[PDB]
Write a protein that binds this ligand. Sequence first.
Ligand SMILES: Cc1ccc(C(=O)Nc2cccc(C#N)c2)cc1Nc1nc(-c2cccnc2)nc2c1cnn2C
Length: 268
Amino acid sequence: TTEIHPSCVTRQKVIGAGEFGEVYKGMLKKEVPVAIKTLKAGYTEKQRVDFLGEAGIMGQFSHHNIIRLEGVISKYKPMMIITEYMENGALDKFLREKDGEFSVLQLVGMLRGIAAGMKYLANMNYVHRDLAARNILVNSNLVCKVSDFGLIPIRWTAPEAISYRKFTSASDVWSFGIVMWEVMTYGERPYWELSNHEVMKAINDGFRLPTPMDCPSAIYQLMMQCWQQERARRPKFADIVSILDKLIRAPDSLKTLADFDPRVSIRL
Ligand SMILES: Cc1ccc(C(=O)Nc2cccc(C#N)c2)cc1Nc1nc(-c2cccnc2)nc2c1cnn2C
């Protein structure tokens, strides 16, 4: 991690909250816009370890689909984690505000990118545990950067992580399946109005999310295999990336759509 001097950072507006300090939009010195998470006076030992630990792992990550760390302020207070700024913001809100505005190839391409970042994290032995559209940022090239803003996301979490806290790359794959469904539905809420308990019961009873509208059959098949109850039967991120890459590079493959199950009948 590069150490940034405080005089090179200007905090402008609050954009969120952190573990113990706000998150700001600002500028980094010609000037590059940035996101800034602070650790404010009074932070605890554990908070400092988690903060500087977070900064450390982020500085290790160098991938096109992982949020880029610009630097850290650790020598002065407040301490700071400073990343690139993504003007299109988080993917979930982005898609819901742009309903229907993209091609199927653009949507699958977003997913290929998310998958590539997740393969990198899994290969680096980093378990995300909170993969969801809300933690993915979009840049002005439509490139998706995996991030983590903090919080329990029952609807995004694999049964074994819920039941007995077994978080692994394979539970991240389940979450990726949900992200796949979020993308192809333009940010619909998974399981709609079902309660957290109703979701767990449906999944244990064997039900799975239905196909999104206008969704390539191959894409629905892939997200369904991310939701295997048996962790060992789920694809690895390497499998996911490879399938998405072959689909994009042979785009007629996406023209075959899964049947959509109408929830309403209109007869004319
Ligand atoms: C500054 C910063 C610090 C940490 C992280 C982060 O992803 N940490 C991390 C830890 C562990 C694993 C992985 C991974 N893989 C990633 C991200 C950012 N940056 C952003 N965060 C927020 C934001 C908004 C509201 C509340 N909290 C945060 N909005 C942003 C940006 C950039 N642009 N915008 C619009």
